[PDB]
Amino acid sequence: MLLPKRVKYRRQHRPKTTGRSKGGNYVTFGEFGLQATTTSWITSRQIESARIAMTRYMKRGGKVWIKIFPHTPYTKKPLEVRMGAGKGAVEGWIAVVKPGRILFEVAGVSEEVAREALRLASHKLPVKTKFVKREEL
Amino acid sequence: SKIDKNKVRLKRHARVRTNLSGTAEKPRLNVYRSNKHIYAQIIDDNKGVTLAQASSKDSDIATTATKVELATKVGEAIAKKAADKGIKEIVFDRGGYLYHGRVKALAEAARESGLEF
Amino acid sequence: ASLKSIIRQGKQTRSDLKQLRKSGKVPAVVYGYGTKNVSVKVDEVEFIKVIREVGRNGVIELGVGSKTIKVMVADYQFDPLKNQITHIDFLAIN
Amino acid sequence: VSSTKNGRDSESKRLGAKRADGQFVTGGSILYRQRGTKIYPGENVGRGGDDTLFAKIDGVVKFERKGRDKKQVSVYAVA
Amino acid sequence: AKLQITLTRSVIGRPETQRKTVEALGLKKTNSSVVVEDNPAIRGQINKVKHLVTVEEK
RNA sequence: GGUGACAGCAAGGAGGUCACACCUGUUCCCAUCCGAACACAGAAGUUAAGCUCCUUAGCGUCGAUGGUAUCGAACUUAGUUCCGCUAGAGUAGAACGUUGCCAGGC
RNA sequence: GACUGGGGCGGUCGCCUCCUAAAAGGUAACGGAGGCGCUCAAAGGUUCCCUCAGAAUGGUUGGAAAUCAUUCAUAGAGUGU
RNA sequence: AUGUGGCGUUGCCCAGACAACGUCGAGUGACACUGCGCCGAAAAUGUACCGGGGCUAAACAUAUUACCGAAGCUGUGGAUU
RNA sequence: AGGUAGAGCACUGUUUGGACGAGGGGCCGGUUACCGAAUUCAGACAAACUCCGAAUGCCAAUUAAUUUAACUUGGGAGUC
Numbered sequence: 001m002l003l004p005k006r007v008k009y010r011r012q013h014r015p016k017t018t019g020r021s022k023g024g025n026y027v028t029f030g031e032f033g034l035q036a037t038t039t040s041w042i043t044s045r046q047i048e049s050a051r052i053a054m055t056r057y058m059k060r061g062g063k064v065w066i067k068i069f070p071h072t073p074y075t076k077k078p079l080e081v082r083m084g085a086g087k088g089a090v091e092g093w094i095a096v097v098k099p100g101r102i103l104f105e106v107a108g109v110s111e112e113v114a115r116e117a118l119r120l121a122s123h124k125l126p127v128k129t130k131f132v133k134r135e136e137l
Numbered sequence: 138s139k140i141d142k143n144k145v146r147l148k149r150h151a152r153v154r155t156n157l158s159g160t161a162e163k164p165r166l167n168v169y170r171s172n173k174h175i176y177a178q179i180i181d182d183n184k185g186v187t188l189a190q191a192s193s194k195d196s197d198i199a200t201t202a203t204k205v206e207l208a209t210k211v212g213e214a215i216a217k218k219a220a221d222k223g224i225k226e227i228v229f230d231r232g233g234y235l236y237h238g239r240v241k242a243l244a245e246a247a248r249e250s251g252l253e254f
Numbered sequence: 255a256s257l258k259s260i261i262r263q264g265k266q267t268r269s270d271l272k273q274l275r276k277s278g279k280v281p282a283v284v285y286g287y288g289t290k291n292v293s294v295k296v297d298e299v300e301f302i303k304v305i306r307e308v309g310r311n312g313v314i315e316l317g318v319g320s321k322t323i324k325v326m327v328a329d330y331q332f333d334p335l336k337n338q339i340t341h342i343d344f345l346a347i348n
Numbered sequence: 349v350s351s352t353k354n355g356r357d358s359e360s361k362r363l364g365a366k367r368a369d370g371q372f373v374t375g376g377s378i379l380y381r382q383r384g385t386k387i388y389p390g391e392n393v394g395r396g397g398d399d400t401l402f403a404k405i406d407g408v409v410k411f412e413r414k415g416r417d418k419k420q421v422s423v424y425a426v427a
Numbered sequence: 428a429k430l431q432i433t434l435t436r437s438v439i440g441r442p443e444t445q446r447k448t449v450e451a452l453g454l455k456k457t458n459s460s461v462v463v464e465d466n467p468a469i470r471g472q473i474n475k476v477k478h479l480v481t482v483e484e485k
Numbered sequence: 486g487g488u489g490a491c492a493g494c495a496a497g498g499a500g501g502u503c504a505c506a507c508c509u510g511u512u513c514c515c516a517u518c519c520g521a522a523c524a525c526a527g528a529a530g531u532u533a534a535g536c537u538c539c540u541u542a543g544c545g546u547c548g549a550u551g552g553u554a555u556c557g558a559a560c561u562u563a564g565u566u567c568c569g570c571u572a573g574a575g576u577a578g579a580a581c582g583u584u585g586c587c588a589g590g591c
Numbered sequence: 592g593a594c595u596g597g598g599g600c601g602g603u604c605g606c607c608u609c610c611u612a613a614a615a616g617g618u619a620a621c622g623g624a625g626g627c628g629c630u631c632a633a634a635g636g637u638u639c640c641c642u643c644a645g646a647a648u649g650g651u652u653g654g655a656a657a658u659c660a661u662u663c664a665u666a667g668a669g670u671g672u
Numbered sequence: 673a674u675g676u677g678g679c680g681u682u683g684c685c686c687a688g689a690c691a692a693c694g695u696c697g698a699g700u701g702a703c704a705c706u707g708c709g710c711c712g713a714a715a716a717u718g719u720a721c722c723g724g725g726g727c728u729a730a731a732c733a734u735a736u737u738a739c740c741g742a743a744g745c746u747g748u749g750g751a752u753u
Numbered sequence: 754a755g756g757u758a759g760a761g762c763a764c765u766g767u768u769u770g771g772a773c774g775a776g777g778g779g780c781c782g783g784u785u786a787c788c789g790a791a792u793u794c795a796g797a798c799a800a801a802c803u804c805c806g807a808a809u810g811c812c813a814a815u816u817a818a819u820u821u822a823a824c825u826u827g828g829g830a831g832u833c
Contacts, residue, residue: 004767011623013611013800018564022760024797025334029770037335069768071798083596084621085350095798100334137302138662141506141535169487171505173528178487178587185489187587194589204526205514235639238514238525269567271552283551285577291550329576331553336705343551345577349595351602352621358607362616365754368813380754387754408814411754419754437744451820458745461819468818474569478558 002044003070003093011087012072017041021100026135029065030107032114033132040127041094042103044070050104050121057117062109067102070095097127143171149233157230158182164223166215166247167230168240175211175239179227188223191215208239212246219252226253257304257316262293280339284318284325287348294318298339314344323348369411372427377403379421388414390422431483432473433460441479448475 017039027033047068054064070093077088097103104121106114115131122129159165159181166179166189175193180186191214193207198214200207219227229247234240248254262281266274271281279295296316304314305327314325329343363381367373380387380401389395390412392404403409407423414420434454438446452472453461462485463469473482 002769006767008766008799009623009801013623015799019759020335022798028796035334065770067769067797069797071767082349085602086352086354086621087623101797137306139535143505167488176487176588180488180586182489185586187488190487190588192588235515235523267568268552268554281551285550293551329551333553338705340553341551343576349599349601350621353602354623354625355603355621356607356625357609360617364615365812367754368811369754370814371812372814421754451818453820456745463819466818472819475557 001048002066007073010073010090011075014074015072015094015096017096017098019098021098024067025100025102027102027105027132029067030063030105031134032107032109032111032118033102033105034118034122034129035100035102035132036097036127037099037130038127039096039098042068042097042125042127043092043094045092046125047095049124053121053124054104054106054117057120058106058109058113062106062113065105065107067105068095068097072096102132103127103129146233153233154230157228159228163226163228164188165228165230168232168234168243170239175208175243177211177215177243179215189215189218191218204239205242208243209246212243213250216247216250216252219250224251224253229254255304255308255313255315256322257296257300257314259294259296259316259318261319262295264293266293275338275340280342282342282344284323284344284346286346289323289346289348292318296342301339301342316344367409369409371409373403373407373409373423375403375406379403379409386419387411388418388420390420392423392425393421428465429462429485430465430469430473431460431462431485433481433483434458434479435481436479438479445476445479448472449479452476452480454480 021036025035047066047070051064051066072095073090073093075088076091103125104118106117109117111133118129118131157165159179161181161183164179164181166177169176169178177191178187179189181188191211193211198207198210216224229244231240236244244254259282260279274295275281278298280298280301282294282296284292284294305312308314310327312326314327315322316325323346325344325346327342328345329341331340331342333340361381361383363383365380367377367379373379378400379393382399382401384399385395387401389401392407394402394404396402401421403423405423405425406427407425408427409421409423411419411421432452432454434449434457437457438449452469453463473480
């Protein structure tokens with residue numbers, strides 16, 4: 001249910017999905033994360049479900065740092081109506097993720113426990129995942 | 138935080154010196170006093186070369202009696218070098234100051250002398 | 255700590271570079287005091303064996319061509335996907 | 349069926365550079381169209397009440413640099 | 428210091444800029460030739476349309 | 486000291502009636518609730534401050550070398566290859582002004 | 592009357608500014624945003640001068656702050672629309 | 673998903689590590705960036721995509737060469753400009 | 754001449770975690786945590802943010818090479 005308090009414009013263009021993660025793609029606030037390998041539009045509902053999966057799994061022992069926010073709004077149009085009467089009304093908020101971006105990040109748990117907790121939420125979420133650790137070397 | 142005057146002078150000069158300059162047919166002379174003495178130095182700013190100079194600290198005019206007669210004589214004495222060359226149209230740059238008192242006396246002496254300002 | 259390192263021959267293209275960067279090597283540089291510009295390629299599994307015990311800040315005695323120079327790890331690029339080093343940067347402090 | 353609130357705009361003005369650096373111009377020629385002072389006048393150059401830059405003699409135009417970022421245009425006489 | 432350029436491809440399907448470069452070299456139809464002095468002005472026009480022509484140092 | 490061509494901000498250090506400032510003023514032309522400003526009349530004492538001499542790069546300013554892409558061309562309908570032009574970060578490094586024409590005094 | 596993702600219903604129709612617009616200019620849709628159909632004998636001319644909202648500092652009633660001095664204070668002030 | 677493919681380090685090491693409640697001998701078991709597979713995938717006249725026959729190469733690849741292939745170009749003769 | 758790609762947050766807006774005490778407040782005026790705004794170390798995002806910016810495309814000038822067009826004024830159209 002995360003969304004901006006108020007946004008300057010309401011009917012904004014549809015972002016890009018070609019290229020690679022512009023930034024934000026190293027785990028630097030926890031100890032174990034999970035990051036994307038294809039591009040997609042991860043939305044408010046499926047972020048919601050994926051955090052549901054992990055707080056419902058760790059039983060509030062650890063925590064999750066959500067490194068993604070739905071800054072842009074998209075619209076839709078009345079149910080299968082004719083073309084050409086202005087743009088439609090808002091329907092949800094999204095965040096484009098490119099190959100590389102750290103999606104979810106957990107900390108303070110067994111490396112095993114993360115290794116399956118981040119496996120669970122991968123299914124709720126429309127981008128193929130990969131599990132990573134804190135960087136060394 | 139008390140401030141000093143000559144920085145404001147330099148600002149005034151830079152700020153209203155924007156449209157005025159010499160062209161070696163229309164030279165300009167400026168003026169400068171601090172507290173006890175008077176300078177003046179004419180220049181043609183295309184070349185930035187000095188032509189004439191007149192000062193109240195100079196030896197040949199070294200008097201104390203009044204602060205107005207020194208302006209008068211320094212004026213009427215730059216007029217000597219002027220009526221030797223370049224004594225037609227010139228501009229009187231007022232430095233950064235008002236037009237009151239010593240500057241007026243200097244301009245009067247430089248004026249009723251053989252010059253064209 | 256005697257990292258065996260070859261020199262990059264003049265004018266590597268982007269194709270030539272990216273195809274040498276598949277056999278396993280990695281481009282590099284040294285600079286600083288008593289030294290000039292050079293383009294070099296360094297081995298990787300050797301480099302990681304070196305910097306898994308020497309510390310991120312530390313000494314190196316790699317041999318570059320004909321004499322040896324004591325250098326320290328300064329900079330890196332390290333693309334994240336299919337983890338492999340892209341660029342490693344050395345400064346001949348002397 | 350529906351009501352579109354938008355649909356407005358104005359006619360585009362043809363602002364910007366009108367003559368080229370290095371090109372011989374004529375007296376009273378318009379060198380740059382602009383709202384404002386994106387480029388300042390220079391030597392033998394004027395500005396009109398629309399902020400329009402123009403030449404005052406027959407010469408050659410050069411675009412140059414005024415201070416640290418401000419820019420200016422001049423005309424130099426001999427062709 | 429002498430080149431021998433031959434038009435081994437057709438101009439059909441190409442942009443107008445490339446076709447104008449081909450005309451300035453002096454080449455008219457497919458497989459036609461021209462003998463010119465080597466010169467950076469000639470070589471820029473060779474480089475623009477290099478996928479269209481063959482060159483040989485005579 | 487004056488004007489005149491392309492580096493700063495400050496921070497400890499010192500040094501002098503040749504500079505110019507700090508001051509004495511309401512007395513006069515000037516001049517505003519206030520000579521706090523602006524004027525003009527002093528010139529007693531004076532580098533404490535401004536000025537002024539390296540300076541600290543600490544802040545700031547420039548700026549490499551490596552090289553991380555987008556015209557052209559094929560291959561293909563999923564971004565891969567060969568080219569040419571190479572950024573923004575960012576490292577090293579420089580950097581506490583080069584100094585144009587006169588007075589005075591050398 | 593016309594336009595119109597058939598027509599009708601509905602909305603709109605002139606001018607100004609910005610995105611779309613692909614670093615010259617130009618460029619469409621019932622694409623996305625706002626304005627106008629004036630005002631000022633000074634808010635015009637010309638000679639001078641003159642230069643911060645906010646904060647911090649304190650200050651006789653303090654609607655906390657307006658009124659009062661000091662440290663700032665990059666112009667963030669401000670400019671009739 | 674234990675389908676298989678290397679480069680890999682490795683914990684336990686033939687002092688006898690995984691089993692059978694001491695026999696037992698050759699590696700054990702783990703942790704990944706990658707190759708081909710895996711199921712994955714369920715409409716109506718009649719086989720039905722090599723177009724057909726057929727093919728384990730006549731498939732897909734790489735590296736050389738040969739040849740065939742247009743009203744393109746060259747030979748030979750002609751026309752009109 | 755110029756602000757697109759890319760990048761970058763220094764300005765306008767969005768941002769998540771992590772931050773500091775004066776104070777309304779706990780009370781019997783106060784403690785203190787706690788509510789809110791502010792500044793604060795800490796880091797992702799933009800068609801209508803930018804200062805740091807391409808490749809190309811544009812204008813021009815030329816004792817810088819190959820090429821054969823270009824313009825002005827008239828007769829005749831078709832095309833929407």
